[PDB]
């Protein structure tokens, strides 16, 4: 398999300001990658797919950038909504897989 | 405008099997491929198994490789996953995915079902 | 004097039943009346005859057919009228919707009683009327000859084909110069048709 | 032990090679006797259609196909005329060799014009149809007219009349004059209408394919 | 005199349709299929709808390369879907295997690749204008032209980043045709039906008055 | 009528196994054997059982690429190993090159490698059913059907990074078939033994009564 | 598409200072980019295209450079009809696209 | 010197349909490919269409796609746009552009005129 590790389990940041998170690729991946947004006891959410491009619908304060095995997820301003566990993914090859997961800190 | 749901989870003793089905409405169902997704309770996350939309291609990872068994019916708009011979680590929580292909994102997850392997 | 389509002579093709007898006979579908005003007909057939006669009855009750027919059109004006027709056979005729979406059935199958042109122009199928004479066709012209006859024989991919479905072919009479008659005399000038299918078949009772 | 030479690996749109099959030992389904086949575009050419001879301005349509006469009180008068160019943008458009003439770069070839008239049993008049070679302009009136090329057609013997033009390459004029007045006895309509009909000769050839502008 | 001949008049080939894969952006789906469209561009519809009933086997060509114009060696498979078959559900399906689906595998570095397809309908000839129903969408529609599919993919085995262009080119050989039919004036609105708009255009171009030339 | 002929019924070539070398990733190997197996598919196995007996000629064909669908060029090793020789142990091993063991030596920008096996068994026609013991996980096997086992490699010297995946066509030529068998029913198990199923299916499916048709 | 982001919605600077501004590109462009001067109520004017050439008639101030996928545009003396709208684009591929537009600063 | 003119512009209700008109001199017309582009409120500028110069390639975007229609006349050096169906964003103003080719930059661009989807 090909795995996918995530640098922080842990982010702190407040509301107004700006964090970006990182992925690290086992091996090259091209530009095939997605991002996830799980919130508390929910279903985990698409967002960033595929490099930049966003799925349908999320807002554009959302925005990721990368190429090869390293890549960034930037959200521009933080919000309160914006707290939950992020995660990536590899779909450049079967079986796909997922990082490990990385949460938000918003410290008042 | 779309639901996933899926039932049949719950305790199960070693061994045993269980069928873990899901329902969707409020799209054209033949057109999507579907997918299973077993979150670990470290909440680490992994695949389960995959079908194409018409029944094509049916991918299975290398773990769960021939001991669980995957179908769909287009007329119902089911999705059924047969699962058999369960240890201690196939106890997670389930959800009901949907792609438009094999190399895209799951953009959607039914709201997933628990299942527990214990004595 | 007679225009063979294409021509040739309808022939029986070497069990499908020859009806001969009482199919062969003409027959006289009703007088259309052309005015001033008035604009094109068409028929259609094999349909005209699916409700009429002993044929109707052979083409209703069997699953395929052959046939052939032979067509004679004739336009009865004294001599102090003008005007001039065409009438051509057009094979496989395939008309079309107008947009500001399809033809209504009634369009497509008219029946015995024919149709009138919403646009007789572009004969309502999209084509040119100047150039429609590449199909055999005969000058019906009030100073002359008052009289049009053809025989078209059975043109169509497969041998047999049902009548209730595919049409063979299509018939139209276009008035392409107007008619015009001094005060008092007789306003319509009738025209009438009449059809005698040759070398029929039919078989799968 | 072969050379290449320079010209191997191109493929040529124009290439008449030959290919595989791709289904070997597939049977299509054979032939059966359907009447009208027709070998080539030159056979089209030789049957006449009817003529736009009036196309002017809102003239509506099934209207633009034939020219109209009547008693004009005047017995000299130009009653109608059009080019002869087949290929060039005008009446003959509506043609049938006028259509596939614009498939073509070159033609060649005598045509053949023939007329018709509509107006009832009883009326009678003379027209003088004169044909003008292509290196001049058309006639001032008749007088100049009747001495070049020309037919008197009558009506009430004549009831349609063929004029062939001796020749074009790759433009020429024929005219329709008045020679006498239009007579009718009483109570009876007092124009007529008179229909065109082109057509091309059995010489008539083609050269260099192009697709058109019609389109 | 032998321009004019209607073996000569369809000969030449030309392009049918341009059909793309984009396994690369947005798209990541990996394969494409092309159901058969003669009637493509209106200009080759113009010239088929002439003749009524036509009789012919064509031959295919695929130019195919990158974005780029740039042709790096890399596989694809070409099948061939005869009619009547089931298609592709996705990049790995099993029916791009099976056995009856005749494929060319070509690599993009060689030059195209060229096939010959047989005379498939069932009657005696293709019907350009079917009257009378098949059995109102229904209304002159042929159910037996049907050609087949062309499905193509991209063998290397899991998202390359390159979307890949193709261009399909057909010449027709062997026609024969029947019962002429007189060009179309009016303009085209949709592909599979006549439908002419309600706004009429003259066939010819008007002048001044009846007499003025030129 | 040409068509329902048993030499063109069993014409087509196919895909009868697709190998992977993997010297890349956490398999090191280097290295493939791949037994000769009709029965791969059981598409293609249930054509054959339709006769008992058969004697052919086959024709085999390499696709190869890497995980990219690209074809850089890199040396490989095709060898045939016939019925009754030793296979190889390593990619190293000295039976990678003997004489007797026919090699084929195909860079992959080439275009395909192909070759053509002759007869092998010595029996007079192969067995699909061979009933009785070959001297109870014997019951019913051939042992005179092997047919050699296609070992292959890349000359490349020592661990190339690149997965070198395989595709493996054949067709029958010159096939001959005796007493013929009814197809199968019954859903497949295992590879070698027809065991079926407990629970039964039905030929037919079912309708409402002995009486009403659609 | 192939999305042209600005870095900066804002940049300050005075009267004889010198300015650079970037341009980012969601994919490689090649050398294809152009930028424009849009004055505040006016049509937006070309300046440079294609990386480093100008059209015809821009003062030579201005200056630019760049490949792939990272741009920049020079000004080697800012003046007071300097201060207006910079956008860059990509003519690399149909269809075309714009940055989100830069806004210079000019503080006394 | 060069003047690009427009004209139509102004406000509208849901779904009407206005033609642009766009009229030069001061150049041959004839040897330019023309387009249109509109500048929403936010200022961010996308293209609308373009036409070649002979009329042999017109290319929308696929926002716009087979909502509007383009078209040019050589001898009134006039670029026409067809636009029907308008929706909310369809709201800004537009100008009338210049180019050499497909891939050259816009060197000229008309004064440009507004265009509002309102009630």
């Known amino acids: 398999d090909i795995v996918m590790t995530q640098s922080h389990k842990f982010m702190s940041t407040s509301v107004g300001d700006r964090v970006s998170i990182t992925c690290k690729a086992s091996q090259d991946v091209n530009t095939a990658v997605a991002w996830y947004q799980q919130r508390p006891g929910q279903s985990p959410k698409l967002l960033i797919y595929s490099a930049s491009y966003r799925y349908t619908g999320v807002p554009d304060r959302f925005t990721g950038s990368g190429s090869g095995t390293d890549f960034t997820f930037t959200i521009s301003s933080v919000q309160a909504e914006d707290l939950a566990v992020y995660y990536c993914?590899?779909?450049?090859?079967?079986?796909?897989?997922f990082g490990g997961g990385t949460k938000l800190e918003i410290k008042r | 405008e779309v639901q996933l749901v899926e039932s049949g989870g719950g305790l199960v003793k070693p061994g045993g099997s269980l069928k873990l089905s899901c329902a969707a409405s409020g799209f054209a169902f033949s057109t999507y491929d579907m997918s299973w997704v077993r979150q670990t309770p470290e909440k680490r996350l992994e695949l389960v198994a995959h079908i194409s939309s018409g029944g094509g291609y049916i991918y299975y990872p290398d773990t769960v490789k021939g001991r669980f068994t995957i179908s769909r019916d287009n007329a119902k708009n089911t999705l059924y996953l047969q699962m058999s011979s369960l240890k201690s680590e196939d106890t997670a929580m389930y959800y009901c995915?949907?792609?438009?292909?094999?190399?895209?994102?799951?953009?959607?997850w039914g709201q997933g079902t628990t299942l527990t392997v214990s004595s | 004097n007679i225009v063979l389509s294409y021509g040739e002579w309808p022939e029986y093709c070497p069990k499908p039943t020859r009806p001969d007898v009482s199919v062969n006979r003409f027959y006289t579908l009703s007088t259309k009346s052309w005015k001033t005003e008035s604009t094109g007909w068409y028929w259609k057939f094999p349909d005209v005859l699916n409700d009429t006669g002993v044929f109707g009855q052979n083409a209703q009750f069997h699953y395929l057919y052959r046939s052939g027919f032979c067509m004679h059109v004739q336009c009865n004006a004294s001599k102090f009228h003008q005007g001039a027709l065409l009438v051509a056979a057009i094979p496989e005729f395939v008309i079309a919707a107008s947009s500001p979406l399809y033809p209504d059935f009634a369009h497509t199958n008219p029946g015995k009683d024919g149709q009138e042109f919403r646009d007789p122009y572009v004969l309502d199928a999209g084509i040119p009327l100047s150039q429609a004479l590449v199909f055999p066709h005969q000058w019906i012209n009030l100073r002359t000859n008052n009289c049009a006859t053809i025989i078209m024989p059975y043109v169509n991919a497969l041998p047999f084909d049902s009548a209730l479905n595919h049409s063979n072919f299509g018939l139209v009479v276009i008035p392409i110069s107007p008619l015009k008659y001094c005060n008092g005399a007789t306003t319509e000038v009738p025209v009438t048709l009449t059809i005698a299918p040759l070398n029929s078949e039919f078989s799968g009772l | 032990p072969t050379e290449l030479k320079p010209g191997t690996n191109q493929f040529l749109t124009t290439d008449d090679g030959t290919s595989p099959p791709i289904l070997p030992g597939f049977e299509p389904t054979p032939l059966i006797h359907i009447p009208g086949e027709f070998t080539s575009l030159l056979d089209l050419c030789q049957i006449e259609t009817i003529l736009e001879v009036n196309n002017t301005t809102g003239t509506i349509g099934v209207s633009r196909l034939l020219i109209p006469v009547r008693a004009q009180n005047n017995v000299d008068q130009l009653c109608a005329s059009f080019q002869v160019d087949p290929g060039r943008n005008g009446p003959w458009q509506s043609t049938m060799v006028g259509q596939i003439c614009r498939y073509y770069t070159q033609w060649s070839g005598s045509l053949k014009v023939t007329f018709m008239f509509t107006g009832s049993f009883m009326a009678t008049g003379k027209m003088l149809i004169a044909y003008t070679p292509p290196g001049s302009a058309q006639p001032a009136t008749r007088e100049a007219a009747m001495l070049g090329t020309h037919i008197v057609w009558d009506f009430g013997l004549q009831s349609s009349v063929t004029l062939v033009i001796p020749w074009i390459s790759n433009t020429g004029i024929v005219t329709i004059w008045y020679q006498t007045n239009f007579v009718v006895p009483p109570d009876t309509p007092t124009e007529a209408n008179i229909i065109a009909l082109g057509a091309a000769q059995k010489n008539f050839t083609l050269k260099l394919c192009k697709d058109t502008d019609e389109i | 005199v032998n321009e004019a001949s209607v073996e000569h008049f369809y000969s030449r080939a030309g392009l049918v349709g341009v059909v793309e894969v984009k396994d690369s952006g947005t798209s990541l789906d990996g394969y494409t299929v092309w159901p058969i469209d003669v009637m493509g561009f209106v200009q080759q519809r113009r010239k088929l709808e002439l003749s009524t009933y036509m009789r012919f086997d064509a031959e295919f060509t695929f130019v195919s390369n990158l974005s780029n114009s740039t042709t790096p060696g890399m596989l694809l498979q070409y099948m061939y879907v005869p009619p009547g078959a089931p298609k592709p559900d996705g990049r790995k399906s099993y029916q791009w295997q099976t056995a009856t689906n005749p494929s060319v595998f070509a690599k993009l570095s060689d030059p195209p690749p060229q096939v010959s397809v047989p005379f498939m309908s069932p009657a005696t000839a293709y019907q350009w204008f079917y009257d009378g129903y098949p059995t109102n969408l229904q209304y002159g529609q042929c159910p037996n032209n049907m050609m087949g599919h062309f499905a193509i993919r991209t063998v290397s085995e899991s998202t390359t980043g390159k979307n890949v262009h193709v261009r399909v080119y057909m010449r027709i050989k062997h026609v024969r045709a029947w019962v002429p039919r007189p060009l179309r004036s009016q303009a085209y609105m949709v592909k599979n039906y006549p439908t002419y708009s309600q706004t009429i255009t003259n066939t010819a171009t008007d002048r001044a008055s009846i007499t003025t030339t030129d | 009528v040409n068509e329902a002929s048993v030499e063109h019924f069993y014409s087509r070539a196919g895909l009868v196994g697709v190998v992977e070398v993997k010297d890349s990733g956490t398999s090191l190997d280097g290295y493939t054997v791949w037994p000769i197996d009709v029965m791969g598919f059981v598409q293609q196995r249930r054509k054959l059982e339709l006769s008992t007996y058969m004697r052919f000629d086959a024709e085999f064909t390499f696709v190869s690429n890497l995980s990219n669908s690209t074809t850089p060029g890199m040396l490989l090793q095709y060898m045939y190993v016939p019925p009754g020789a030793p296979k190889p142990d390593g990619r190293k091993s000295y039976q990678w090159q003997t004489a007797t063991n026919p090699s084929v030596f195909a860079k992959l920008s080439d275009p395909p490698p192909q070759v053509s096996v002759p007869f092998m068994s010595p029996a007079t026609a192969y067995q699909w059913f061979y009933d009785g013991y070959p001297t109870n996980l014997q019951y019913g096997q051939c042992p005179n059907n092997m047919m050699g086992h296609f070992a292959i490699r890349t000359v490349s010297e020592s661990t190339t990074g690149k997965n070198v995946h395989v595709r493996v066509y054949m067709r029958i030529k010159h096939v001959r078939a005796w007493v013929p068998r009814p197809l199968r029913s019954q859903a497949y198990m295992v590879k070698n033994y027809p065991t079926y199923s407990q629970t039964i299916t039905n030929t037919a499916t079912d309708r409402a009564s002995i009486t009403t048709t659609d | 598409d192939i999305v042209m982001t600005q870095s900066h919605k804002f940049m300050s600077t005075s009267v004889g200072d010198r300015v650079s501004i970037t341009c980012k590109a969601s994919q490689d462009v090649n050398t294809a980019v152009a930028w424009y001067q849009q004055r505040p109520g006016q049509s937006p004017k070309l300046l440079i295209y294609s990386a480093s050439y100008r059209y015809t008639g821009v003062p030579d101030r201005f200056t630019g450079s760049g490949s792939g996928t990272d741009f920049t545009f020079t000004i080697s003396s800012v003046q007071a009809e300097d201060l207006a709208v910079?956008?860059?684009?990509?003519?690399?591929?149909?269809?075309?696209?714009?940055?989100?537009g830069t806004k210079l600063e000019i503080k006394r | 010197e060069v003047q690009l003119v427009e004209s139509g512009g102004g406000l509208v209700k849901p779904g009407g349909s206005l033609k642009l008109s766009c009229a030069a001199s001061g150049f041959a017309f004839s040897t330019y490919d023309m387009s249109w582009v509109r500048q929403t409120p936010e200022k961010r500028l996308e293209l609308v269409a373009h036409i070649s110069s002979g009329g042999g390639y017109i290319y929308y975007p696929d926002t716009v796609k087979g909502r509007f229609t383009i078209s040019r006349d050589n001898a009134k050096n006039t670029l026409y746009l067809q636009m029907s169906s308008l929706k909310s964003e369809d709201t800004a103003m537009?100008?009338?552009?210049?180019?050499?080719?497909?891939?050259?930059?816009?060197?000229?661009?008309?004064?440009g005129t507004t265009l509002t989807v309102s009630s």
């Open positions: 995915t949907r792609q438009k292909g094999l190399y895209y994102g799951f953009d959607y």
């Open positions: 993914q590899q779909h450049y090859t079967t079986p796909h897989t």
